[PDB]
């Protein structure tokens, strides 16, 4: 279905037109940690529920649930299969090994982004659809429609949700604020948020046009 990307294009349209805070719009899922081993292996990530995923170079995906045992494997054509750490096909040994290596690295060394974001609506576990980097940021596109942008220089982050029509901004002080895009469109926002939303427009355009 091209509905998600159309919602994303609709959000892009809204961003072009952009007391606007609304806690009812707080995201349920975002990327809290990531490791870029894309030269040889792929991109590993942690979601805020402590689940870990990898988008491998061969365009396959392996997802470990936060129970630390359950695994979903998604083949290139979209075929989904389920397995566990203890019960798995031999062909998946290397990919499982790599996921556990990434999991250990992130757990040992890395900060959990949005650890202070306060947690009714059904939470459906997404996977990483695609990602790319610029000099200034990493852009992460989740299967639920959400687009996350992490800025390297000041550690500020944006979480863009097309379904909720909302944006969450994590500032340098690690304080989070969630805004309704319609309220930003109608009333405007600070230059701090405005400048990052301008860059986000370019990034989302890049994502959609590819």
């Amino acid at each position: 279905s091209p509905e998600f990307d159309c919602h994303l294009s609709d959000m892009l349209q809204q961003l072009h037109s952009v007391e606007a805070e609304d806690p009812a719009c707080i995201p349920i899922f975002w990327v809290s940690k990531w490791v870029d081993y894309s030269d040889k292996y792929g991109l590993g990530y942690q979601l805020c529920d402590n689940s870990v995923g990898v988008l491998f170079n061969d365009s396959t995906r392996l997802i470990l649930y936060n129970d630390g045992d359950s695994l979903q494997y998604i083949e290139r054509d979209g075929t989904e299969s389920y397995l566990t750490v203890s019960s798995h096909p031999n062909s998946l040994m290397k990919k499982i090994t790599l996921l556990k290596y990434f999991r250990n690295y992130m757990s040992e060394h890395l900060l959990k982004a949005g650890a202070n974001i306060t947690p009714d609506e059904l939470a459906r576990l997404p996977y990483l659809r695609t990602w790319f980097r610029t000099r200034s940021a990493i852009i992460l596109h989740l299967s639920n429609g959400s687009v996350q942008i992490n800025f390297f220089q000041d550690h500020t982050k944006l979480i863009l949700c097309p379904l909720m029509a909302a944006v969450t901004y994590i500032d340098e002080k690690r304080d989070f604020r969630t805004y309704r895009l319609s309220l930003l469109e109608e009333y405007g926002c600070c230059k701090e948020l405005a400048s990052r939303l301008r860059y986000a427009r370019t990034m989302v355009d890049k994502l959609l046009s590819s």
């Binding site: 990531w34 490791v35 870029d36 690295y105 992130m106 890395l110 900060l111 992490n150 390297f152």
Partner: peptide, 6 residues
């Protein structure tokens, strides 16, 4: 960087 904030 090759990883998120340490």
């Amino acid at each position: 960087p090759l990883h998120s904030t340490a």
